[PDB]
Amino acid sequence: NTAASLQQWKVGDKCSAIWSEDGCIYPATIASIDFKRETCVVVYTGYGNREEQNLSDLLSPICE
Ligand SMILES: C/N=C(\NC)NCCC[C@H](N)C(=O)O
């Protein structure tokens, strides 16, 4: 994980998010960010769902 940059993300960046449904970590890609709410919508890669997560709650992209 990239701890130092774990609050700032940009649209089009890959990440990991906590799926609200399993509570588990899954790979997701940032589709859009609302910097005012400090949240962003991410699309779960491989699944095709999109969920709104906090920028500071996002997790580093999977590479393994
Ligand atoms: C981010 N993860 C997912 N979707 C966006 N997973 C969908 C399949 C897993 C789900 N627990 C099931 O078995 O239905």
Side-chain angles (χ1 to χ4, degrees), residues 19 22 26-27 44 47-49:
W19 198 31
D22 284 315
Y26 293 89
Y44 293 102
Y47 302 101
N49 289 335

